[PDB]
mmCIF file of C-alpha atoms in Angstrom:
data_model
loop_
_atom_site.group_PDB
_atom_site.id
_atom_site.type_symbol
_atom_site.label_atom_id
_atom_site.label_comp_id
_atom_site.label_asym_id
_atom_site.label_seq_id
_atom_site.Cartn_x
_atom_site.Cartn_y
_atom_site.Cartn_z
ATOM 1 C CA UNK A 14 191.472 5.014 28.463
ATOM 2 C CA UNK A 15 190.462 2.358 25.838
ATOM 3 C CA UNK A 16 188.936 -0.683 27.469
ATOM 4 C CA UNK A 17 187.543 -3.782 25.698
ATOM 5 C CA UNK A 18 184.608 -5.491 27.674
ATOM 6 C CA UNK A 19 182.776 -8.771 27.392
ATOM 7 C CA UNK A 20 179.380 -9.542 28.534
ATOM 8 C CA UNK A 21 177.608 -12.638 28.641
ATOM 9 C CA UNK A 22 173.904 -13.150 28.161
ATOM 10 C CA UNK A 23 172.085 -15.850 31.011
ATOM 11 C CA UNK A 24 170.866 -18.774 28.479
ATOM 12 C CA UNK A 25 166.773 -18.834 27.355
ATOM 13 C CA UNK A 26 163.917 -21.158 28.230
ATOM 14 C CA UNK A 27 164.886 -22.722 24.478
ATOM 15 C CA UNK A 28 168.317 -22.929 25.168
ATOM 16 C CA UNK A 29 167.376 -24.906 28.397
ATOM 17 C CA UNK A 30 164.901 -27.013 27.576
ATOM 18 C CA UNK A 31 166.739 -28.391 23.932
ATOM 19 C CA UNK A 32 169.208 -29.362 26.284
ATOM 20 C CA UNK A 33 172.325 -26.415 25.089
ATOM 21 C CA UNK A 34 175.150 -26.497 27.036
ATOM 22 C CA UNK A 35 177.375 -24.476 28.880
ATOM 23 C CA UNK A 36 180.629 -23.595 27.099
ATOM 24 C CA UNK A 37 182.345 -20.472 29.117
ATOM 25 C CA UNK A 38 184.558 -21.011 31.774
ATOM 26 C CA UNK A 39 184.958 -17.511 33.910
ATOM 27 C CA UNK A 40 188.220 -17.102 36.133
ATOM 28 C CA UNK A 41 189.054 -13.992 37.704
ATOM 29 C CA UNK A 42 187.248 -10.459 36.725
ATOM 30 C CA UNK A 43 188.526 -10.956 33.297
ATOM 31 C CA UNK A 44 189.251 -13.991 31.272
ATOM 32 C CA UNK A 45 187.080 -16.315 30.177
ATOM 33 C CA UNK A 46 187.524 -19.831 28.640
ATOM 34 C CA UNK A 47 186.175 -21.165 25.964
ATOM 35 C CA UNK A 48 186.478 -25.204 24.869
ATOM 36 C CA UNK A 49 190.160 -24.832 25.500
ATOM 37 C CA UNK A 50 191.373 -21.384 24.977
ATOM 38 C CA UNK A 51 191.222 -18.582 27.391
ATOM 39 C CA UNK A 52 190.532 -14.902 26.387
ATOM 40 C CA UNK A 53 191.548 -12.131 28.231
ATOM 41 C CA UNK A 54 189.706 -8.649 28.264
ATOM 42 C CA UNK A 55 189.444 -5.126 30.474
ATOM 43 C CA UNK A 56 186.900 -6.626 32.128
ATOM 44 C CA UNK A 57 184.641 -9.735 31.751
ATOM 45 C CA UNK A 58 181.186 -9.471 32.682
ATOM 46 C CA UNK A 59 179.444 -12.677 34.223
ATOM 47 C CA UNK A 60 175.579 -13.419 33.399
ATOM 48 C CA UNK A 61 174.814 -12.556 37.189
ATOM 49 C CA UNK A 62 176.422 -9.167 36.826
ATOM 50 C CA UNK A 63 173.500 -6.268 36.702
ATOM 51 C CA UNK A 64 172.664 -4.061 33.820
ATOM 52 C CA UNK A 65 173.876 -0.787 36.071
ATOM 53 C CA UNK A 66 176.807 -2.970 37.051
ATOM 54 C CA UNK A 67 177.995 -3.043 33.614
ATOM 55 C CA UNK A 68 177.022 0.109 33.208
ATOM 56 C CA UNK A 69 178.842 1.625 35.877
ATOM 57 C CA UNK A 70 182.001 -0.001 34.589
ATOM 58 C CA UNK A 71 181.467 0.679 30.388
ATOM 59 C CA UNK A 72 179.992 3.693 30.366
ATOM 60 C CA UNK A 73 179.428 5.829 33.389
ATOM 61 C CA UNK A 74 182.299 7.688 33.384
ATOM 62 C CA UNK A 75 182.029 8.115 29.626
ATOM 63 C CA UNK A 76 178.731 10.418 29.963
ATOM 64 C CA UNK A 77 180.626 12.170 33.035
ATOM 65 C CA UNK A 78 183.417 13.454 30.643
ATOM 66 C CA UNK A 79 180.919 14.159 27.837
ATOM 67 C CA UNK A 80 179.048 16.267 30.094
ATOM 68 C CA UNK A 81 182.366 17.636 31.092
ATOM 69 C CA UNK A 82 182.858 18.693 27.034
ATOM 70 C CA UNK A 83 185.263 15.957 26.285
ATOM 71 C CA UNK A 84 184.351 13.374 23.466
ATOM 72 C CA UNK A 85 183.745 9.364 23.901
ATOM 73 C CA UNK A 86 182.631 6.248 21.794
ATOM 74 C CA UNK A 87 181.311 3.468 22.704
ATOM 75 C CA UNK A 88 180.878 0.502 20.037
ATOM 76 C CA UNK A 89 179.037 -2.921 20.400
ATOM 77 C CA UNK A 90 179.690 -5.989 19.010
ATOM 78 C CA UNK A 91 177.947 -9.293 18.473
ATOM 79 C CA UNK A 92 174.121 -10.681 16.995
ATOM 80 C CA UNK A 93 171.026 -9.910 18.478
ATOM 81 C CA UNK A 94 171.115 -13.458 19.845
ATOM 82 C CA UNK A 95 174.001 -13.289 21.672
ATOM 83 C CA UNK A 96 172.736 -10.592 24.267
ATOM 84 C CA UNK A 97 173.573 -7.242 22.546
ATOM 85 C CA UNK A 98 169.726 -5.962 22.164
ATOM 86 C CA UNK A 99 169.822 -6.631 25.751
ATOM 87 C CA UNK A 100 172.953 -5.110 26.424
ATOM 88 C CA UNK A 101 172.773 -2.145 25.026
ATOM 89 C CA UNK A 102 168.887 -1.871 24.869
ATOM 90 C CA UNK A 103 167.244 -3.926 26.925
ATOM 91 C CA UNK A 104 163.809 -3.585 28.590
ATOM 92 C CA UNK A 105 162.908 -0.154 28.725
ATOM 93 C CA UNK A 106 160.261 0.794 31.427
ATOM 94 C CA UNK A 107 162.061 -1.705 33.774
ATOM 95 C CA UNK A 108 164.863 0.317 35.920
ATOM 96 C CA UNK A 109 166.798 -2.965 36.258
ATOM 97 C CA UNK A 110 166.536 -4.323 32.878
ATOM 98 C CA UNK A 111 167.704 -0.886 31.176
ATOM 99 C CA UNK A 112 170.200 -0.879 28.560
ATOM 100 C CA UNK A 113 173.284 1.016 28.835
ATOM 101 C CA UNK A 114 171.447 3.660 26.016
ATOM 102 C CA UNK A 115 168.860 4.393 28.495
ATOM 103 C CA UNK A 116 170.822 4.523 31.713
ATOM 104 C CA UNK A 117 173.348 6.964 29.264
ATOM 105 C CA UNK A 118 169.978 9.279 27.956
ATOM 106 C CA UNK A 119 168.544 9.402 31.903
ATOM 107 C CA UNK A 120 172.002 10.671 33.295
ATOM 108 C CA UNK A 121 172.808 13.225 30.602
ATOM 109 C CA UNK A 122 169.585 14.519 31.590
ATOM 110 C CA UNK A 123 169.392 14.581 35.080
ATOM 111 C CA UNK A 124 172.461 15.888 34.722
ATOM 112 C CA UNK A 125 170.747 18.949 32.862
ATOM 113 C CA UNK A 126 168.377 19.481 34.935
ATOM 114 C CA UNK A 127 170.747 19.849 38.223
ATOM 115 C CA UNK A 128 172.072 22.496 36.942
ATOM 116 C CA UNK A 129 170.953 26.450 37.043
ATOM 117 C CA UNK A 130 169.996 28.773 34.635
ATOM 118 C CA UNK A 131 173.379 30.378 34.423
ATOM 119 C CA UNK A 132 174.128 26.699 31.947
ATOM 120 C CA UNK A 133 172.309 27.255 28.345
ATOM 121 C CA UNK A 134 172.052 23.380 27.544
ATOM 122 C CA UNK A 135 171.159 22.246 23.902
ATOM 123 C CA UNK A 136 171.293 18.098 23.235
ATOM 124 C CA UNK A 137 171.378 17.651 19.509
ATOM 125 C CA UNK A 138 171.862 13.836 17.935
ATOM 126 C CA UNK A 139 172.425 12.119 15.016
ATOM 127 C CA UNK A 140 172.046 9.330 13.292
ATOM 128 C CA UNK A 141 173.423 6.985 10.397
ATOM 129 C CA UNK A 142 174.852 4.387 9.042
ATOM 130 C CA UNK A 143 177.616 2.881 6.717
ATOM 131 C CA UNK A 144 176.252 0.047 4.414
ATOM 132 C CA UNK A 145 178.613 -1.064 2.218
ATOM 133 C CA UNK A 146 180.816 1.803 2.850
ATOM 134 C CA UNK A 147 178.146 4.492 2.095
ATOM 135 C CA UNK A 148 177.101 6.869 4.346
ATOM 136 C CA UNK A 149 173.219 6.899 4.851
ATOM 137 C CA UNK A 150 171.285 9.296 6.867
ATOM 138 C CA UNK A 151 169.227 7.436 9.197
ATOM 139 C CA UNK A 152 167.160 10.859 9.915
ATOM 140 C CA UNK A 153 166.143 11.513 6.639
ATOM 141 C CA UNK A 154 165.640 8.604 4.089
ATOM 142 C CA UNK A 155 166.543 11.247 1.158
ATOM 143 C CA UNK A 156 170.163 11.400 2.118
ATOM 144 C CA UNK A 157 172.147 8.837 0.869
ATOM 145 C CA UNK A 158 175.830 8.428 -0.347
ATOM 146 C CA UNK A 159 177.265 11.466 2.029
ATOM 147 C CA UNK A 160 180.671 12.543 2.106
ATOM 148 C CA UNK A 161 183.213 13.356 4.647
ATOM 149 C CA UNK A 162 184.958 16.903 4.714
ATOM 150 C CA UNK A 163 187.250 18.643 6.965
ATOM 151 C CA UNK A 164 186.803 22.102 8.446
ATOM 152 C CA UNK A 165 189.254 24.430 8.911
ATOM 153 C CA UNK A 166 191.490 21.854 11.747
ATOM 154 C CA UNK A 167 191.778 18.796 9.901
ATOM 155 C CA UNK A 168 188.958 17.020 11.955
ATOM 156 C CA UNK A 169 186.915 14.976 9.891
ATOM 157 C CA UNK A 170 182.548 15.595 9.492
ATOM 158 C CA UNK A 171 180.148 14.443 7.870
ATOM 159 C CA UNK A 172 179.018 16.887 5.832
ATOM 160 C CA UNK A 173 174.771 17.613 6.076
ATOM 161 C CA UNK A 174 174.501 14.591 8.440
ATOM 162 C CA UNK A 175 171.278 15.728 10.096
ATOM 163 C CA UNK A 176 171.184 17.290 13.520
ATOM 164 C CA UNK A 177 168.027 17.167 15.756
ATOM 165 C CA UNK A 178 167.873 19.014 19.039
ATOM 166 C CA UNK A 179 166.065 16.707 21.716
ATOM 167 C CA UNK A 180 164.794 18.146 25.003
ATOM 168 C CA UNK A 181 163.541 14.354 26.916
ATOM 169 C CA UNK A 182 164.881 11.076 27.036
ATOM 170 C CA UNK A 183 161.805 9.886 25.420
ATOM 171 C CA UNK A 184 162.607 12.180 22.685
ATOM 172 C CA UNK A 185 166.145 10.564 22.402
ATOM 173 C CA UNK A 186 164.727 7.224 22.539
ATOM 174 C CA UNK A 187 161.877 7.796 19.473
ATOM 175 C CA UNK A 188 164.681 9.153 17.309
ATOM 176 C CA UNK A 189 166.590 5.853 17.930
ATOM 177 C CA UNK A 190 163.739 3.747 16.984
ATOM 178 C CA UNK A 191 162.581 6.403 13.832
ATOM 179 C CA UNK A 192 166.792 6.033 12.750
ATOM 180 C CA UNK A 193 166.798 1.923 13.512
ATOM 181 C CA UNK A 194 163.334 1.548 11.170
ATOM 182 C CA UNK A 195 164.981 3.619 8.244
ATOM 183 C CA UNK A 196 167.720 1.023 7.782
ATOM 184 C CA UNK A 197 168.552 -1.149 4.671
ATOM 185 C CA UNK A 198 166.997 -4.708 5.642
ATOM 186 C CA UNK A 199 167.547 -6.408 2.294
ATOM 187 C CA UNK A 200 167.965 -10.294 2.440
ATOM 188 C CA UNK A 205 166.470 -10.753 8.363
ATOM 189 C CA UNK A 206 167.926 -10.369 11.909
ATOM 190 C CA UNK A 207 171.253 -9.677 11.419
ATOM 191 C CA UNK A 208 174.068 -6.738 11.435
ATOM 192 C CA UNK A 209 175.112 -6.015 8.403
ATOM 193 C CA UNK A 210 176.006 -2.201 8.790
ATOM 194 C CA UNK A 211 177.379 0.044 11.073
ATOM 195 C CA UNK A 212 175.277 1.872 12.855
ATOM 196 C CA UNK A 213 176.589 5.297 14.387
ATOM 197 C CA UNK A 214 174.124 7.595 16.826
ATOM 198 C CA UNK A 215 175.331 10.857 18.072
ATOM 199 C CA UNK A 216 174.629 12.153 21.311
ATOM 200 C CA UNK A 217 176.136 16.402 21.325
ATOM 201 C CA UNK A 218 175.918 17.790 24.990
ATOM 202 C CA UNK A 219 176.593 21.572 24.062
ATOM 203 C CA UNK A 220 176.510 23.606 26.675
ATOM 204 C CA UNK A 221 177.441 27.808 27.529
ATOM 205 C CA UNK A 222 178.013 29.652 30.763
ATOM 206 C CA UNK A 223 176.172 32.571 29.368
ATOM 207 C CA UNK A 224 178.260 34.888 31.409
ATOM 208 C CA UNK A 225 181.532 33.343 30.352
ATOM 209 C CA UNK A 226 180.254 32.978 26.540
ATOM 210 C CA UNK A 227 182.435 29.834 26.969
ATOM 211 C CA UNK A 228 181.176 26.955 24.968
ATOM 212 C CA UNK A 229 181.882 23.129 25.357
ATOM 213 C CA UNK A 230 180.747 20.565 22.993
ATOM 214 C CA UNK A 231 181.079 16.984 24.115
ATOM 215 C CA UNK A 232 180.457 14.322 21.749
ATOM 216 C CA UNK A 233 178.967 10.667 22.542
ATOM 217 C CA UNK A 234 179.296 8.126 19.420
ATOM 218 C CA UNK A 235 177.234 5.157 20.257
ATOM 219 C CA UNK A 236 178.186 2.760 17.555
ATOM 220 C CA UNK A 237 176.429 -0.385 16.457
ATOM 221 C CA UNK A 238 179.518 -2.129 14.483
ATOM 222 C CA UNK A 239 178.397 -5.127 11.636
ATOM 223 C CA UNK A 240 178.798 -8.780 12.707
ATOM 224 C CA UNK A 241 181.329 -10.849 10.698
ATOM 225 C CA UNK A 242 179.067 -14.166 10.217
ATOM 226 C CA UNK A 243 180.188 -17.789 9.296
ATOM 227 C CA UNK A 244 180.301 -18.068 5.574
ATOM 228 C CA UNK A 245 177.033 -19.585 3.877
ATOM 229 C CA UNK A 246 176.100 -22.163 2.124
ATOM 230 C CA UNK A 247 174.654 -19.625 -0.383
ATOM 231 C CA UNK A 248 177.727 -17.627 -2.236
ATOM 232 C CA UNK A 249 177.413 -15.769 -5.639
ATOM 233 C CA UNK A 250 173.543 -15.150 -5.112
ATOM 234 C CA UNK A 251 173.295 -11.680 -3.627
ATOM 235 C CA UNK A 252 174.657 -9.194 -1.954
ATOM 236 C CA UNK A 253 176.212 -11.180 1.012
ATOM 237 C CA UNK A 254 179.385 -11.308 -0.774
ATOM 238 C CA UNK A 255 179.762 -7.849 -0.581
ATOM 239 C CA UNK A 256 178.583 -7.246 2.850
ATOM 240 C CA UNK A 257 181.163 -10.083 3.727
ATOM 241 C CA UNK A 258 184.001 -7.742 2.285
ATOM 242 C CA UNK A 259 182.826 -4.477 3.161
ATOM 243 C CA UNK A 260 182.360 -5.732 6.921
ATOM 244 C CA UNK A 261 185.683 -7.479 6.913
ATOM 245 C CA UNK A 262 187.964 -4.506 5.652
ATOM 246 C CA UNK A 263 186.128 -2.101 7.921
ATOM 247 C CA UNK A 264 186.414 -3.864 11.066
ATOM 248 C CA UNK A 265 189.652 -4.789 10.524
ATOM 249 C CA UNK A 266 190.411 -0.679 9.905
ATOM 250 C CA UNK A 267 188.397 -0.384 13.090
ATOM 251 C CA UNK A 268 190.936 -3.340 14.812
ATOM 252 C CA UNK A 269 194.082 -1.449 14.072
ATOM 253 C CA UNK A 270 192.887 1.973 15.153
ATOM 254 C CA UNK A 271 191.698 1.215 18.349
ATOM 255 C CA UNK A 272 195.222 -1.368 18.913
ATOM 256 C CA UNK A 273 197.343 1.836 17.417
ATOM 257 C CA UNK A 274 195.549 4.245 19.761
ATOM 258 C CA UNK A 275 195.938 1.261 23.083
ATOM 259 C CA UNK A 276 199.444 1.371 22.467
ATOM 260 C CA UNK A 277 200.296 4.877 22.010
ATOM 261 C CA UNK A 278 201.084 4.882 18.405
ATOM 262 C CA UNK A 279 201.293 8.519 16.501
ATOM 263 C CA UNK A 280 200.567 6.889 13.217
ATOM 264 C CA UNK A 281 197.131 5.869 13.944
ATOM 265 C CA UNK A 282 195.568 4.856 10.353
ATOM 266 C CA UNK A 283 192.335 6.927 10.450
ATOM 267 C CA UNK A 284 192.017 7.481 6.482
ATOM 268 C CA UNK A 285 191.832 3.650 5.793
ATOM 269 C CA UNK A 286 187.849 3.560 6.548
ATOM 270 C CA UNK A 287 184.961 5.920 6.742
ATOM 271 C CA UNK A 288 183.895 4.973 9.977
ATOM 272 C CA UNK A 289 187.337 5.725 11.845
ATOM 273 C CA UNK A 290 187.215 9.549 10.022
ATOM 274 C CA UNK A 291 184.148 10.117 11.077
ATOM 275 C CA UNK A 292 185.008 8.842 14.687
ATOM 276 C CA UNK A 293 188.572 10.577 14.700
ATOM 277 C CA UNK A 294 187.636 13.870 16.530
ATOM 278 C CA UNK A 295 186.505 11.169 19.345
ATOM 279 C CA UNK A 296 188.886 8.486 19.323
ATOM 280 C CA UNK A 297 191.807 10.625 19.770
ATOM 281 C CA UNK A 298 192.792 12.900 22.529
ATOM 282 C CA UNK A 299 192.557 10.296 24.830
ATOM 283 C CA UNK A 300 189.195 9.971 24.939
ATOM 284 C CA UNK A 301 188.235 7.068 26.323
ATOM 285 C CA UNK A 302 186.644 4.244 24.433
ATOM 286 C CA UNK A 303 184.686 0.981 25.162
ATOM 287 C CA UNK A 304 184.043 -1.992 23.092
ATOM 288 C CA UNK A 305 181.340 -4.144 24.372
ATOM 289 C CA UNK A 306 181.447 -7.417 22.486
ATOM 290 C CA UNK A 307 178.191 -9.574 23.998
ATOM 291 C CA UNK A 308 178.176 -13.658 23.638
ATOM 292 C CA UNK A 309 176.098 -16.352 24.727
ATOM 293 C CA UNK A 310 177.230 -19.041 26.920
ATOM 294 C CA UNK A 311 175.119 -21.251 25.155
ATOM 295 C CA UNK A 312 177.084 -24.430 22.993
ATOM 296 C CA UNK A 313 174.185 -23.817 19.444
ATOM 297 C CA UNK A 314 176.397 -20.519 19.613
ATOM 298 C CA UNK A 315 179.733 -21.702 19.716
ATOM 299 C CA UNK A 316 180.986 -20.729 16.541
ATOM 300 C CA UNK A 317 179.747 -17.579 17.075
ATOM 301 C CA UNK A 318 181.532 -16.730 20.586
ATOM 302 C CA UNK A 319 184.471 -17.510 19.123
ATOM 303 C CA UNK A 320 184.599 -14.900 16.719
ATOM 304 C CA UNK A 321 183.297 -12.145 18.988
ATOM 305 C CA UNK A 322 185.770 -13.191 21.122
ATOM 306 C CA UNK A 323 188.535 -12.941 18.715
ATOM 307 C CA UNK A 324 187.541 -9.419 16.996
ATOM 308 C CA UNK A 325 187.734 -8.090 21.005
ATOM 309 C CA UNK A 326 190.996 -9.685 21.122
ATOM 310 C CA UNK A 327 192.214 -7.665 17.642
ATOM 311 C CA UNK A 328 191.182 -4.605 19.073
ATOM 312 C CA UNK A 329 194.177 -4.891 21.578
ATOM 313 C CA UNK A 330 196.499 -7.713 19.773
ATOM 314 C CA UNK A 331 198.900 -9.897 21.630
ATOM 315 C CA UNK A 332 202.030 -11.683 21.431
ATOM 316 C CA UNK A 333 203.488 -15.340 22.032
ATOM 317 C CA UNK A 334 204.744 -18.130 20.973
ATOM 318 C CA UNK A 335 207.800 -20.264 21.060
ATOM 319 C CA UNK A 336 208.677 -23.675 18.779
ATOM 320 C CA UNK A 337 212.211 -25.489 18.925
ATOM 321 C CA UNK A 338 214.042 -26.813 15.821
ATOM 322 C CA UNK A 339 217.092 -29.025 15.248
ATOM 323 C CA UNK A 340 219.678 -27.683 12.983
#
């Protein structure tokens, strides 16, 4: 139920014609080498593979079980150079270059409309983000610094997050760009926040009364970058912590939850309270880490690479000594 995935970007016309080179070595449906060292995901997807391909295989079922009233997250991982715009985005008014956010809105709504009268749908989202372990509403630039509560179950909310009810996918897709243009910039191009939209299919059999309330967290996590030449300056140091202890509170929630565990460490971060309600109840989860095949971004596939492999862990070695 929780799957890490790995997508790789085709290379540009200026990674082509400065002469980059080819660094990923793909065998079987899954691993992929890198200089020397293999990786080993849920699923590896090649630079031929289609957007609906991956798609189909990330996130399909995800919107069938929100639609159903269960709860699901999907989180993405990597710069905006190594394919995740693309990804996740991509080229909106083309049907084969859609991003898995559009190909998610268009379902949920066809979905909708399928259905008859005797349904009473109502899609309400959200939006914010968690820079430097605050809580900013993404919807309205006058909420900052907002807390998490728990009501009545202990199921963690944040607390006057602001909820929109959207009736198009056009709608849906204007309140991602308003809630990605309210963000906190500072000193670029880069991730340096966590970026959590909401997607709450609610839905009521008016006969029955019976309500479900299906939850869709599509997260944008922060990008752990190479340290720079620049230290004690700014607020990169900080960013560099914050974004270190949070994914690595991310890494051992989602390995707890892969391998069973009942003492899944929630409280350590913000981010996995306010995903709790969606992580749990085995509800599934995919992590889309996006590189580029390219050999300028070496460094940088290694890492996404290895934060995909901490969401799982593993376990090896072997050394003899004399005595």
């Amino acid at each position: 139920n929780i799957k890490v995935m790995c997508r790789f970007r085709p290379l540009n016309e200026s990674e082509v014609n400065r002469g980059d080179k080819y660094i990923a070595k793909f065998q079987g449906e899954d691993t992929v080498v890198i200089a020397s060292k293999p990786y080993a995901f849920d699923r590896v997807f090649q630079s031929s593979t289609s957007q609906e391909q991956v798609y189909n295989d990330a996130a399909k079922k995800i919107v069938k079980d929100v639609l159903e009233g269960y709860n699901g997250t999907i989180f993405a991982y990597g710069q905006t150079s190594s394919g995740k715009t693309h990804t996740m985005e991509g080229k909106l008014h083309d049907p084969e270059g859609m991003g898995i956010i559009p190909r998610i809105v268009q379902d949920i709504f066809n979905y909708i409309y399928s259905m008859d009268e005797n349904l009473e749908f109502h899609i309400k989202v959200s939006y914010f983000e968690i820079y430097l372990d605050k809580i900013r509403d993404l919807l309205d630039v006058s909420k900052t610094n907002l807390s998490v509560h728990e009501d009545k179950n202990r199921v963690p909310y944040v607390k006057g997050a602001t909820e929109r009810f959207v009736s198009s996918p056009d709608e849906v897709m204007d309140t991602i760009d308003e809630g990605k243009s309210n963000r906190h910039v500072a000193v670029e191009h880069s991730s340096r926040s966590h970026s959590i939209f909401l997607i709450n299919v609610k839905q009521e059999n008016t006969q029955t009364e019976q309500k479900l309330s299906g939850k869709l967290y599509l997260v944008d996590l922060a990008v752990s970058e190479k340290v720079s030449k620049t230290g004690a300056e700014g607020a990169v140091l900080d960013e560099a912590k914050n974004i270190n202890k949070s994914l690595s509170a991310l890494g051992n929630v989602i390995s707890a939850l892969a391998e069973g565990s009942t003492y899944v460490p929630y409280r350590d971060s913000k981010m996995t309270r306010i995903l709790q309600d969606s992580l749990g109840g085995n509800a599934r989860t995919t992590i889309v880490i996006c590189c580029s095949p390219s050999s300028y971004n070496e460094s940088e596939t290694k890492s996404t690479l290895l934060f995909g492999q901490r969401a799982k862990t593993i376990k090896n070695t072997v050394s003899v000594n004399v005595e």
